[PDB]
Amino acid sequence: HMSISRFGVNTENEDHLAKELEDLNKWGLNIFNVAGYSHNRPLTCIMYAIFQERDLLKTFRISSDTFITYMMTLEDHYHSDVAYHNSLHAADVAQSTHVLLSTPALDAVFTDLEILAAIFAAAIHDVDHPGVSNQFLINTNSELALMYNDESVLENHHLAVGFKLLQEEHCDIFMNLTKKQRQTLRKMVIDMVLATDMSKHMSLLADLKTMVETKKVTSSGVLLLDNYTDRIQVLRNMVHCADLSNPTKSLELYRQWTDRIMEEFFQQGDKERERGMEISPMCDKHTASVEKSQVGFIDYIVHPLWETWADLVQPDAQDILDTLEDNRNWYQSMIPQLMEKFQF
Numbered sequence: 001h002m003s004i005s006r007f008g009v010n011t012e013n014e015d016h017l018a019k020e021l022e023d024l025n026k027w028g029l030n031i032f033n034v035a036g037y038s039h040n041r042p043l044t045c046i047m048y049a050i051f052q053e054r055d056l057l058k059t060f061r062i063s064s065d066t067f068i069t070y071m072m073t074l075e076d077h078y079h080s081d082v083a084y085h086n087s088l089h090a091a092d093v094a095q096s097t098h099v100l101l102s103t104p105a106l107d108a109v110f111t112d113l114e115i116l117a118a119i120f121a122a123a124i125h126d127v128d129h130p131g132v133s134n135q136f137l138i139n140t141n142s143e144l145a146l147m148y149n150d151e152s153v154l155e156n157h158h159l160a161v162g163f164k165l166l167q168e169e170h171c172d173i174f175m176n177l178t179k180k181q182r183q184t185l186r187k188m189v190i191d192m193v194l195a196t197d198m199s200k201h202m203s204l205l206a207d208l209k210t211m212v213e214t215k216k217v218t219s220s221g222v223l224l225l226d227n228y229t230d231r232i233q234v235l236r237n238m239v240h241c242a243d244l245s246n247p248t249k250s251l252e253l254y255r256q257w258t259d260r261i262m263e264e265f266f267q268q269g270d271k272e273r274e275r276g277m278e279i280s281p282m283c284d285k286h287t288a289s290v291e292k293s294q295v296g297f298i299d300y301i302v303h304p305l306w307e308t309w310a311d312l313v314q315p316d317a318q319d320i321l322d323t324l325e326d327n328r329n330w331y332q333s334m335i336p337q338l339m340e341k342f343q344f
């Protein structure tokens, strides 16, 4: 029971886990190892480590036992057999969001409640993901698309599941928040998860560009944000950036993530084919070109996003940008010798 107290998870390798978690505050954390040494409970482990590191459990009076119970059922509601959108991906976005919240240009800009909302949003943002895209769910007239009227169908679902889990007995981690804190937290979390809908990517990016065009900083380089509206706009872009962070990690990590997203796409493609539908872009293992698509993904989606975020917080994200360019160069080099999914 002491290593649960220390880690929030059972582990046969306490020492290895602890050494991996020394990188908790770094972009170079290896979440695959964390999964390895945590009996495959990366989200519970990384969330417990994050909440301990930021004193969130103290500040908001969240019982660590109730937290672990909530995080274990949340993590169970991610599907192990979905190749990318499983609890490892959620863990990674939560850890990446945790690192982005400490970027020096944002120092002291956000409230504690904002910090809590963003990390919690990251943790729940893909829960109960079925391994197929919104468009597939819309095209197959699925119950989820009927329920949510084709609008941010999975994202609404992730939120509903995340919040419904809080009403299970013994799982309400926010019980000691005041009513006003619970209301505010709820609104911010909804906002941020809905912002992870890829079809909002271009509108988010445009808004973010306006914020770069108008940015002002103190003479120490800290961003000056005027009101709630400015801050939530940065936080929704932050979570969106963390969700699209895989190509800004070390190549060894990025390649693992790409193998996973492609397996997931190919599995959807097989579903589409089994039922005689036209196979979606990227989902046909026969015609796919993994390297070229990554290069396209970076050039048209990931790079423009991160170049703008980098402009907003400069110079704090320059290295993340350098890695993203370097990785683009690697994928480009391995080519043998999209856009509608991110718009409307």
Ligand SMILES: O=C(O)Cc1ccc(Nc2nc(-c3cccc(Cl)c3)nc(C3CC3)n2)cc1
Pocket (backbone or CB within 6 Å): 133, 134, 135, 198, 246, 247, 257, 258, 261, 282, 293, 294, 297, 338, 341
């Ligand atoms: O599947 C969707 O409809 C929305 C979506 C799009 C992209 C992602 N993530 C992702 N998407 C791609 C990707 C690559 C090429 C084309 C397209 Cl549409 C997406 N590549 C990667 C690499 C970083 C691991 N990740 C997740 C969800």
Ligand SMILES: [Mg+2]
Pocket (backbone or CB within 6 Å): 125, 126, 154, 196, 197
């Ligand atoms: Mg999602």
Ligand code: NA
Pocket (backbone or CB within 6 Å): 075, 076, 077, 078, 079, 080
């Ligand atoms: Na599960």
Ligand SMILES: [Zn+2]
Pocket (backbone or CB within 6 Å): 089, 093, 125, 126, 196, 243
């Ligand atoms: Zn995600």
